[PDB]
């Protein structure tokens with residue numbers, strides 16, 4: 578069995594910014610979700626080999642996880658906040674697409690997404 582390469586976290590030719598919205602997405606949004614008791618399945622790419630999910634990457638063609646997002650934020654990968662917000666939403670959507678309602682992992686995603694939405698609701702105006 579085989580995992581795909583992980584999502585890109587480094588691309589020197591991609592133009593970058595460090596903005597107050599992106600700083601909020603690291604210091605508030607990612608940090609809030611990362612410390613949560615349900616974060617652990619989301620803190621790195623899905624290891625479909627060790628988890629015995631051989632169809633995971635047959636179904637999920639845009640993988641995303643908070644380990645990737647953390648690296649992207651810490652390494653200033655993004656131009657704008659929307660790119661990072663999209664990564665979070667991709668991560669939640671993947672979980673809901675792959676799994677069944679009420680599965681433990683879906684409940685975990687829902688708890689993280691509730692906090693994501695609460696924090697994103699107060700994304701600061703760009704300075």
Ligand SMILES: CCc1nnc2scc(-c3ccccc3)n12
Nearest residue numbers: 617618619623628672675676682
């Ligand atoms: C985002 C994780 C995930 N998404 N779909 C499934 S079925 C099982 C898991 C899982 C549970 C614990 C640890 C690692 C993976 N997942």
